[model samples]
Target: MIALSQFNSLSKDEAAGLLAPCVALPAWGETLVSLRPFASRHALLQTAREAMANWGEDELNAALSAHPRIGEKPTDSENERLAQALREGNARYEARFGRVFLIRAKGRSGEEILQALTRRLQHTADEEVAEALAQLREITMLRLEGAIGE
Candidate 1:
């Protein structure tokens, strides 16, 4: 993680490069870079949320392209079954929505993620896309938080 002071001082291209892993959209990274020298981490995160709220299909697809299809491996055999379920769930979701299923999986249990996937699969195309964008936002924020330090 780069310290906020260091992040604030980085060149525009460098800062945008640092932000690339947080979200795939160069425009989004560039937007944040242009608004640099954030007063606080909270301020930076708030700006990110604001930028993401304007995402449309193109923005969403650009961001989604970076995420893995949810579910593949887990910590153990017990959870492997859950992982299998998630794999199948991801397939169904992609078939229905025509995109990978994504959620912020850092803190949630496999079962919890599976449940969310199952629930999200039932959403209408418009609703699911919106939900996916929201999830992507959560993911980007998490990555940003980790990438920038105080």
Candidate 2:
């Protein structure tokens, strides 16, 4: 609900409260907070993208914990079926990658999400980590759009 100008003026801790829900990494939020006074939406998103690009394994592990597996909400029996499979896939994904599988699920269907999980499982550790970081960046950008306005 905060305006972009007002967001730039917030104290570090206050900014963190708004940014924390946008991304799970405290360091990422701190980076944004310290680099305050974004001139435009493009500046903020660009800064966020830059921060995400530098994330390493530890950062990936810490932030992935905040995301939910796809198909977490099952309102119909058909959805429940997909939810169960996605839940099981999550376990398998963790066993293989040692962390949760994260994707930007807002506009994707359950089947598409499950397919992505299946496909991602085939990636080597290095590739999977890269994919995860990319997905997290998309998610954070989407959330930031909702949290800030002109």
Candidate 3:
């Protein structure tokens, strides 16, 4: 585990290398890299939290692109049924909204994911974008917590 204190002393490339796999927001990544030499562990975490919470539309979209749709197998390792459901939901969502539905399905069940996706399909585009961004923030915050603790 890389300690936060150790991260603070690393060069920009070093910090980015450590943070890159955990999240995909370019601005956030750059911010972490730029701030690494000066921030304390708590400050780094706080900054990350704030960056996610206040991400602009473009940043949110980039973050969304990094995620697998809810229940999706992630092209990595995940249950087949969940992946199938994710595929179905992704298709349905894109057909309806002209974009992918972004949700954090880390601790959610497949049924719950389906239900949420179904409900989200009913939202207006603006409303859905706001909701999706909020979910993105949640996911980033969760990931930051683990990374900072390491």
Candidate 4:
């Protein structure tokens, strides 16, 4: 992971480049650069999670509208099956939530994703949004760590 010192010197664009893959929005990442010289990586990530989770409804909707559950797939059956699961889970998620579903797929198993989708469907709308925000935090932090490389 990047040392707090290393993070300290990153230009705003550089910091955004590092953080943006955690989610789709560069605007989210750029905000963190000025808040730098973090006490630790934990602090940096926690702060980013809290700040970015509050994305304006309009931008959040636009981002979600363009978001894809699967990308970079080839024509193999193995690839196909996982893609099928992603779409199936997403359809159920939209049906339940009345909006799109988003998640961090890295290191998550297909069964785990499906199970999470099933489990979260039990939540009330407010509860479900809270749960998804928590998951979004996961995606953000994972990307943060992966980018920083501690």
Highest TM-score model number: 1
Tally clashing residue pairs in candidate 3: 0
Task: Quote each prediction's TM-score.
Answer: 0.87, 0.84, 0.76, 0.67
lDDT of 2 by residue, 1-150 (tens): 789999999998999899999877899999999999899988898898888888887888888776565445566698898988888888899778767678889989999999999899888889988888888888988999889887
Clash pairs for candidate 2: none
**43-80: candidate 3 lDDT, tens digit per residue:** 77777776667666777667657555434664444577
Per-residue lDDT tens digits for candidate 1, residues 45-64, read: 89989998888878888777
Give the clash count for model 4. Answer: 2
lDDT of 1 at 132: 84
Point out where model 4 deviates above 4 Å. 1-4, 53-63, 69-87, 95-98, 105-108
Worst 10 residues of 2 by lDDT: 66-75
- Clashing residue pairs for model 3: none
| Candidate 3 Cα misplacement greater than 4 A, ranges | 37-40, 65-87
Q: In angstroms, give how far residue 87 of model 2 lies from its true place.
A: 2.5
Q: Candidate 1, overall lDDT?
A: 0.86
